[PDB]
Design a protein around this ligand. Structure first.
Ligand SMILES: [Cl-]
Ligand SMILES: [Cl-]
Ligand SMILES: [Cl-]
Ligand SMILES: [Cl-]
Length: 33
């Protein structure tokens, strides 16, 4: 699936899903490869 660190999160501002990297703090809409 996602490289290390990447996970999906629901925005706390109306629930849109983004990809977040807990290692690097990166975030993006598109799926990381
Ligand atoms: Cl992880
Ligand atoms: Cl979440
Ligand atoms: Cl959030
Ligand atoms: Cl949202």
């Amino acid at each position: 699936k996602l490289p290390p660190g990447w996970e999906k999160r629901m925005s706390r501002x109306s629930g849109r899903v983004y990809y977040f990297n807990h290692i690097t703090n990166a975030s993006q809409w598109e799926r990381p490869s």
